[PDB]
Amino acid sequence: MNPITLAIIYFTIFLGPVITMSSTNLMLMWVGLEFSLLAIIPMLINKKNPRSTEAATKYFVTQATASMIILLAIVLNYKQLGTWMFQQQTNGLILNMTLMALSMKLGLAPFHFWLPEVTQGIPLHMGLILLTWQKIAPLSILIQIYPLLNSTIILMLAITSIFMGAWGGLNQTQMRKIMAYSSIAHMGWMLAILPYNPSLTLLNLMIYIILTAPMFMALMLNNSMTINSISLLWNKTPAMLTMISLMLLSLGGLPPLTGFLPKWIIITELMKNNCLIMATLMAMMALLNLFFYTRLIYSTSLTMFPTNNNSKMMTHQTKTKPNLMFSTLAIMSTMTLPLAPQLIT
Amino acid sequence: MMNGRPGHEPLKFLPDEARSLPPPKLNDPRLVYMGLLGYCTGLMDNMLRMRPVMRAGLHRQLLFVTSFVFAGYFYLKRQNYLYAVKDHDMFGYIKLHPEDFPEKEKKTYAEILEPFHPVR
Amino acid sequence: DGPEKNYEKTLAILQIESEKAELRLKEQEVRRLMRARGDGPWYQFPTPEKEFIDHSPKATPDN
Amino acid sequence: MLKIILPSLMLLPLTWLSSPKKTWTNVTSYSFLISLTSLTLLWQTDENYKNFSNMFSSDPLSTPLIILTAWLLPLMLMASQNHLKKDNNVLQKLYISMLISLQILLIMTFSATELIMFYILFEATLIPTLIIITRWGNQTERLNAGIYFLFYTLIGSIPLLIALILIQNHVGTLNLMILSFTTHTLDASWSNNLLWLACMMAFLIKMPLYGVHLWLPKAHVEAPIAGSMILAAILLKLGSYGMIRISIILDPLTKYMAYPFILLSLWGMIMTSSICLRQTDLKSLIAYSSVSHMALVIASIMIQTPWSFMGATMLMIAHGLTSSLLFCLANSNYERIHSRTMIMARGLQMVFPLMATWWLMASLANLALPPSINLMGELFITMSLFSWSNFTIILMGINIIITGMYSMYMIITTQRGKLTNHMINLQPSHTRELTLMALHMIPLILLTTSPKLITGLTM
Amino acid sequence: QWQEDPEPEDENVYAKNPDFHGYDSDPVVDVWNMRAVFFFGFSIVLVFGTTFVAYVPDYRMQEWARREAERLVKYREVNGLPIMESNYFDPSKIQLPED
Amino acid sequence: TLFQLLREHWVHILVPAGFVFGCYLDRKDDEKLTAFRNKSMLFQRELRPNEEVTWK
Amino acid sequence: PFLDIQKKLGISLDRHFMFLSAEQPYKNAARCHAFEKEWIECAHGIGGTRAK
Amino acid sequence: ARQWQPDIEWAEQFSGAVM
Amino acid sequence: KFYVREPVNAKPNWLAVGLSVGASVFMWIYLIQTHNEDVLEYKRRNGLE
Amino acid sequence: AMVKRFFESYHEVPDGTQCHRKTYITTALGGICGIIGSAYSVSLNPADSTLEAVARVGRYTFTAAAIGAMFGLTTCVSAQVREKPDDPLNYFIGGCAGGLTLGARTHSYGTAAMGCVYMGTAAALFKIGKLEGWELFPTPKV
Ligand SMILES: CCCCCCCCCCCCO[C@@H]1O[C@H](CO)[C@@H](O[C@H]2O[C@H](CO)[C@@H](O)[C@H](O)[C@H]2O)[C@H](O)[C@H]1O
Ligand SMILES: CCCCCCCCCCCCO[C@@H]1O[C@H](CO)[C@@H](O[C@H]2O[C@H](CO)[C@@H](O)[C@H](O)[C@H]2O)[C@H](O)[C@H]1O
Ligand SMILES: CCCCCCCCCCCCO[C@@H]1O[C@H](CO)[C@@H](O[C@H]2O[C@H](CO)[C@@H](O)[C@H](O)[C@H]2O)[C@H](O)[C@H]1O
Ligand SMILES: CCCCCCCCCCCCO[C@@H]1O[C@H](CO)[C@@H](O[C@H]2O[C@H](CO)[C@@H](O)[C@H](O)[C@H]2O)[C@H](O)[C@H]1O
Ligand SMILES: CCCCCCCCCCCCO[C@@H]1O[C@H](CO)[C@@H](O[C@H]2O[C@H](CO)[C@@H](O)[C@H](O)[C@H]2O)[C@H](O)[C@H]1O
Ligand SMILES: CCCCCCCCCCCCO[C@@H]1O[C@H](CO)[C@@H](O[C@H]2O[C@H](CO)[C@@H](O)[C@H](O)[C@H]2O)[C@H](O)[C@H]1O
């Protein structure tokens, strides 16, 4: 891409969610989601191979279908109440299709099947945008109508996402697919608490993002797409072994890392509302995530896999990466639990 | 939960009514820990770039420490204010609704018959 | 130091922890009432803005 | 506690800012001095327990466990030096930092005043423990050992987290002192019976309870020596210490809820002690011996008597020193011939006469020779269980017989008989190795001299 | 086969330094590590820690309690009161249920 | 004294300084908890002639 | 809105055509203008829960 | 004996399309 | 001279150093000043000294 | 709808009585779960022909209905014989009988044994939830 194209397309990628988050009118919120879909497609398919074409196409047809269902809900509500925002009097079925369609946009299970495939087919830096920046606009809509949402559908989506994110990540040798299943599991936690406390949804979103961003940067450093590729870190960039291990354990929610906080606080709030059974099931199956992260930690920093002869030529070369944003996010995603009271209220 | 409360300014980081609160100490333990994290960030950054961990870029290390403390102070002020508002609302609501929060006259243990459960 | 210091610091610790405990229980009671009745400063869910209603004389009279 | 915790935290910069030739001498020496400072917690001239702040306390249960923790850190460092001497300088410093991290976490764990703080520190210990086992263990089975250890703990710990949140939502606090004073009788509902199990299972898995103990023989056989020392001495005691703290709020359901766990422990202690008779791996034998001893701790905490709690406290400390000693003794032969098979090296009294003396005292401690604190703890546990039901002595009696059999069996097999003389690499005992044994055994004898210090809360 | 080092050979630690104490291959580092362990572990911690513990006074108020018991036994006997009563709490301070 | 000597032996102030600082923080913890000094049932009394506090 | 940028800046990008009672071209009142004006005005300032 | 480290056979169990 | 290729980091980026020390020294001064005014306003509003 | 009411009729009368009606209700519930599972199976793992898809739908639905019948029957007979309406143990026995049925249909002692324990525990906990007033999907309160 030439600079003019990059500026326009990246500006539109940034603009869409800003429109969605700032709009009073539901139609302008939908317009914001439309900008996101249109602008991200050329970035998804930029490298132009059959896999990137498959990824961009699957992303387009899912997202465009979900966008039509969202528009149907907006139009039906406009018919019912003569207004462009959902109210307490909005028909419950209208709200349930909004929830269905937004959850399909987010890749929550059982509308999740597209997300591991699209993440696998695109460059790592685009996977980073897909799993972080692109979540904000659909979640921002949901947070606005949190008193209107049906707790039954939410919890069923939430528990399904945690279950399939867990079992999904257990079978993966591809890093891009592991991150996609990690996304789905964490979205399950974000959604479960949204109808009770939307501030804790945002707390989980922020901690997920500052964990996922430096994890993607670590993959980007050597372009490690598989377990066997990342297992060569000890020979290529051993200095990263400490922070990758702690970020993985933080993503799994192990105390005393920052990633324990979202699971801990959401359980606390779910049980203030007597949602004991779901909270128990959620927390128990979230341990399965820690299993496949541990196996990943086993192959990177706690053992040394076999290396190859050409890697010696790599040790002669100097690197200019990572940028210092990696260190900041890496530290704040792992070592900030002592500052927990300043993050929840 | 508090966002729609009376007298709520949009996108105001530090409302003027927050200036009645005592400001945090500059050696507050939470601010000392913030500066320590900034120092760790500088050292980790040196390690990741294959630089002498403690020696390289003391100017870069100092900026990391000062930014964490500087940001943390103002964020701590905002967090102090939000907690103060929460208590201001909770207690104010308690006073407007004395029928929902009665003072419960408690009985002494001379009157309470707790069951005894022998251990044996 | 003498036994008085530890003994009386324990009472101070006990007073703080007791008062935090009752403040924690009272907040949940307040939140429950405020969310169910909507009569407090919290859980004030938005309603349409009335400043954008047009109050001018309309093209027709019966409006 | 801050005057103990802050110097412990300063060991981390001391490790990393020391010269390569001074690191071990530096960190070991100050670790000894930090053990000296922890003795201040024993200055208890009244019956009011020390509450230093809202966050940290110390009473007659946590004080012995804190001091034993502080003492283990220097001992673990000496134990690690020889097998780390081929690692480069940064890897040695990383290992020391893992050992200091456990010391810091465990001291904070035993002095925490609030249960979710206990839980967070209780769970935090898994990270350095797993790293030690898997990064510095010798065999390919160390990775499986890491998985069992981590996930036996975690599956039990999640229900504990739910119970702690539930108690706090109901009471408004998890502060231990306030929970003690304001406790009220529980109703014997199904919901409360599940609450009891959620509060107990993580501590019971950690002990470990017979039936869910398979993680511990795996973890010991595969861990490095300093990992075995901390695991057997202190980490198992987190479960017993957790059970004693939290059972105060569980009455009166422990009267009937305890039966399956008394049965598993009293029968299980016979199954695991009898395994020690036919165990070919010396480390595994010592590990199964721990499971048998910790079964007694489980039973006496379950019956909740003044004698039973006092016997459990003594046994916790005595087992901590004794089992750590046995692992160190076994590791000294392994470092010479690099096998854990008990029957391989034989007649070693011929070539290591003073090390054989350390072997004998460790074995005599293990089979509870009077007046050792090992026997004192087991004796008062036996008295309390006999009171609970006179038929418990039958299972106690069988375990006492079997414990003597395997304790002397280990000595006869390895120290006596003809020397396996093809082992020409049996270098004389190191000064460090003989010093390490003495640092275990002198405190055991000194504590036998003054057993008031480890009686616990009830006496 | 792959490219891998052979296993290192067994080494006798005493061959080069027959005064090896177990701590370090450098002789001077070795002897000072030995001295620090013996000095701080034994001379300081075990001797002075033992001394300090020995002179903790009235540990858990055991000496006061026996002293207080003798005072009460003396008092309760000259005045003819029972040495120890069944009721810890005076029954006048208790209000039982009517039923 | 000497940069080669000092660069080697300066680390000997870390743990002692942790102890002194740890002791200082423990005295600050005492100061926050004086709400019942000389006010408990068990121990409260009249202040001696030139006594400002019963414990510090 | 999730971010109240429009309120903070005191502008109106989409706040002023949100319901029937809003301003119409050439002052052509929409159907049910008076009923929607009454409903919006009753609800103002008391929150959604009470308004219901 | 030397500490065990993963050999080719160990590393090849992550070389498949799935686990 | 040692490196066959000239390093990128052969000499300090003097502009970067100056901006960094300027930014840190400014932030420390502004932080201390703002803390001073925050104390005085707090005392004024609460009628303290 | 009335379909919801047909499922509330399970709890209208105490356990151990009207065992015929309770067996129809649980058989219907099991069948519905079999139809849902079959729909996802054929959609995501399509069969080689339509007659195999329809054959697999019947296999799943009848097997799921059989499990629901055995659970509902065994639970009621167990409460009737033991004269204990409010015992979660009756539900554990029924859930184990359902778990054994699943193993018998799939020819697996491991599924029978593993099915018995997991399904027994889930069913026993359901009864405890009914007695103690647990909510599966509570509405927001605080
Ligand atoms: C990426 C973010 C930062 C940059 C922000 C965006 C502004 C960028 C400003 C520089 C852009 C100029 O970029 C310039 O674009 C013109 C488009 O007319 C291209 O030029 C185009 O027209 C000219 C006509 O003479 C010919 O070169 C050719 O027909 C075609 O390529 C140039 O090849 C490219 O160099
Ligand atoms: C709550 C307690 C917190 C515990 C904190 C956890 C600390 C981090 C644990 C993960 C360890 C990182 O993993 C560790 O990385 C270092 C480099 O840094 C490697 O270090 C070793 O190998 C690398 C090459 O691979 C060499 O360049 C290096 O000099 C050598 O020491 C270790 O072999 C590896 O095991
Ligand atoms: C763990 C290691 C511990 C190391 C222990 C070192 C302890 C040293 C013991 C010093 C004991 C002597 O201590 C000293 O005794 C005298 C007795 O004249 C007492 O002194 C007090 O009583 C005497 C009685 O005549 C008066 O004259 C005097 O004016 C008064 O201060 C005090 O108690 C103390 O001043
Ligand atoms: C094979 C073992 C399976 C283990 C899993 C758990 C088994 C227990 C569930 C089956 C028990 C009987 O079936 C259960 O009772 C009746 C059926 O009429 C319904 O019972 C419930 O219905 C609705 C829920 O929609 C509630 O509002 C109502 O108060 C309650 O009666 C439930 O929808 C059904 O779940
Ligand atoms: C109260 C207790 C009641 C007990 C009854 C309920 C328990 C039901 C147990 C079901 C056991 C599974 O059922 C059993 O599966 C095995 C699997 O080898 C199958 O066994 C048969 O076929 C298999 C292969 O298909 C052959 O290898 C085997 O030699 C043959 O016996 C049968 O289908 C059945 O014998
Ligand atoms: C291993 C898997 C199991 C993990 C175990 C999880 C922890 C242990 C579970 C204990 C069960 C909780 O038991 C349940 O608690 C809830 C919440 O207080 C209370 O139950 C009640 O709560 C409130 C009243 O306070 C009612 O509005 C609610 O409808 C009802 O469920 C009862 O006390 C008991 O019915």
DSSP code string of chain J: -HHHHHHHGGGSS-TTS-HHHHHHHHHHHHHHHHHHHHHHHHHHS--SSHHHHHHHHHHHHHHHHHHHHHHHHHHHHHHHHHT-TT-HHHHHHHHHHHHHHHHHHHT-HHHHHHHHHHHHHHHHHHHHHHHHT--SSPPP--
* Residue E26 Rama label (left phi>0; alpha psi -120 to 50; beta): beta
d(CA A229, CA A223): 8
Q: Per-residue DSSP letters for E7-72?
A: PPPP--TTTT-TT--SS-SSHHHHHHHHHHIIIIIIIIIIHHHHHHHHT--SGGGHHHHHHHHHHH
Q: Gaps (C–N > 2.5 Å) in chain C: which residues precede them?
A: none
Residues of chain D neighbouring J88 (CB-CB closer than 8 A): 190
Closest CA–CA distance from residue A73 to any residue of chain D (Å): 38
DSSP 8-state code for residue E5: P
Domain residue extents for chain D: 2-459
Q: Which of A1, A4, A13 to mutate to test the pocket of ligand 1 (most atoms within 8 A of CB)?
A: A4
Evaluate whether residue B13 is within a structural domain.
Answer: yes
Q: Are A221 and A152 in contact (CB under 8 A)?
A: no
d(CA C6, CA F30): 9
Q: List b or e across D100-133, with b for residues whose CB sees 16 or more CB atoms inside 10 angstroms.
A: bbbbbbbbbbbbbbbbbbbbbbbbbbbbbbbbbb
Closest Cα to residue A157, out of A103, A198, A114?
A103
DSSP 8-state code for residue D458: -
First to last CA, chain C: 84
Domain around B33: 1-97
> How many A from CA of A107 to the centre of ligand 4?
30
What is the residue with the minimal CA distance to atom 27 of ligand 6? A274
Burial grade of C18 (CB within 10 A; 0-12, 13-18, 19 or more):
middle
Q: What is chain G's alpha carbon radius of gyration, rounded to the nearest angstrom?
A: 13
> How many A from CA of J105 to the centre of ligand 5?
9
**Coil vs helix vs strand at D168:** helix
Torsion of CA D390, D396, D400, D401, to 10 degrees: 80
- Is the four-CA dihedral J14, J17, J23, J25 of positive or negative sign? negative
Q: Are D123 and A254 in contact (CB under 8 A)?
A: yes
d(CA D246, CA D164): 10
Closest CA–CA distance from residue J126 to any residue of chain C (Å): 27
Question: Which experimental approach was used here?
Answer: cryo-EM
DSSP 8-state code for residue D172: S
Q: Which residue bears the tokens 């300088």? A: D89
Binding-face residues of D in 173-202 toward C, CB within 8 A: 173, 175, 177-178
Q: Which residues line ligand 4 (CB under 6 A)?
A: J 7-8, 10-11, 25-26, 29, 67, 71, 95, 98, 119, 122-123, 126
Q: Is E95 on the interface with B (CB under 8 A)?
A: yes
> How many A from CA of A5 to the centre of ligand 1?
9
Q: How far is CA A133 from CA A197, A203, D263, in A?
A: 22, 15, 56
**Coil vs helix vs strand at D270:** helix
Count of domains forming chain A: 1
> How many A from CA of D161 to the centre of ligand 6?
14
CB atoms within 10 A of CB A312: 10
Contacts made by residues D428-431, CB under 8 angstroms, sequence distance 24+: D428/D352, D428/E14, D429/D332, D429/D352, D429/D354, D429/D355, D430/D82, D430/E13, D430/E20, D430/E21, D430/E22, D431/E21, D431/E22, D431/E23, D431/E34
* Cβ-based neighbours of C4, under 8 Å, separated by 6 or more: F40, F42, F43, F54, F55
> How many A from CA of D191 to the centre of ligand 6?
6
User: Rounded to 5 degrees, what are φ and ψ at H18?
Assistant: -130, 180
CB atoms within 10 A of CB B106: 6
Type of residue at A294? T
Evaluate whether residue B2 is within a structural domain.
Answer: yes
Question: Counting ligands in written order, which one lies closest to the CA of residue J65?
Answer: 4
Of D184, D185, D304, the CB nearest to B119: D304
d(CA A181, CA A184): 5
* Cβ-based neighbours of B66, under 8 Å, separated by 6 or more: B35, B38, I23, I24, I27, I28
Stated as kind and residue range, the H or E segment containing D57 is: strand D57-58
Type of residue at J7? F
Q: Which residue bears the tokens 């330094």? A: E17
Q: Determine if the peptide bond prior to D371 is cis (ω within 30°).
A: yes
Q: Which residue bears the tokens 């599966």? A: J136
Q: Is A1 in the pocket of ligand 1 (CB under 6 A)?
A: no
Compute the C-alpha angle A231/A239/A119, nearest 5°.
50
Q: Which of J8, J19, J102 to mutate to test the pocket of ligand 4 (most atoms within 8 A of CB)?
A: J8
Q: Are A128 and A216 in contact (CB under 8 A)?
A: yes
d(CA A332, CA B6): 34
Of A326, A332, A336, the CB nearest to B48: A326
3-class DSSP string for F1-56: CCHHHHHHHHHHHHHHHHHHHHHHHHHHHHHCCCCCCCCCCCCCCCCCCCCCCCCC
Q: Is D194 in the pocket of ligand 6 (CB under 6 A)?
A: yes
CB atoms within 10 A of CB D401: 11
Q: Are A18 and A83 in contact (CB under 8 A)?
A: no
Q: Do C31 and B89 touch (CB under 8 A)?
A: no
Q: How many CA atoms lie within 13 A of D245 on its CB side?
A: 30
**Coil vs helix vs strand at D88:** coil
First to last CA, chain G: 20
Evaluate whether residue B104 is within a structural domain.
Answer: no
Residues of chain E neighbouring B113 (CB-CB closer than 8 A): 96-97
Q: Is D144 on the interface with H (CB under 8 A)?
A: no
Contacts made by residues J21-29, CB under 8 angstroms, sequence distance 24+: J22/J72, J22/J75, J22/J76, J23/J69, J23/J72, J23/J73, J23/J76, J24/J72, J25/J72, J26/J68, J26/J69, J26/J71, J26/J72, J27/J65, J27/J68, J27/J69, J27/J72, J28/J65, J28/J68, J29/J68
Q: How far is CA A118 from CA A68, D273, D358, in A?
A: 20, 56, 64
D457 token code pair: 């809360």
Closest Cα to residue A74, out of A129, A17, A23, A15?
A23
d(CA D175, CA D170): 13
Alpha helices in H1-19 (DSSP H): 8-11
Q: How far is CA D307 from the centre of its chain?
A: 21
E16 token code pair: 């080069």
Q: Which residue bears the tokens 């068990």? A: F42
Q: Do D14 and F21 touch (CB under 8 A)?
A: no
Q: Per-residue DSSP letters for D325-378?
A: HHHHHHHHHHHHH---BTTTS--GGGT-HHHHHHHHHHHHHHTT-TTSHHHHHH
d(CA D223, CA A149): 51
d(CA D194, CA F21): 46
What is the residue with the minimal CA distance to atom 24 of ligand 6? A274
Q: Which of A222, A241, A297, A331 to mutate to test the pocket of ligand 2 (most atoms within 8 A of CB)?
A: A241
J125 token code pair: 């906990």
Q: Angle between the D142-171 and D215-222 helix axes, to the nearest 10 degrees? A: 130
- Is the four-CA dihedral D365, D368, D372, D376 of positive or negative sign? positive
- Pair type for strands D57-58 and D50-51: antiparallel
Q: Is D190 in the pocket of ligand 6 (CB under 6 A)?
A: no
CB atoms within 10 A of CB A166: 23
d(CA D301, CA D267): 16
Stated as kind and residue range, the H or E segment containing I19 is: helix I14-46
d(CA J73, CA J66): 10
Evaluate whether residue B4 is within a structural domain.
Answer: yes
Burial grade of D43 (CB within 10 A; 0-12, 13-18, 19 or more):
middle
Of B30, B33, B48, the CB nearest to A327: B48
3-state helix, strand, coil in chain D (%, to 5): 75, 0, 20
Burial grade of D143 (CB within 10 A; 0-12, 13-18, 19 or more):
buried
Evaluate whether residue B111 is within a structural domain.
Answer: no
Domain residue extents for chain F: 4-54
DSSP 8-state code for residue A145: T
Count of domains forming chain B: 1
Q: Do D252 and B114 touch (CB under 8 A)?
A: no
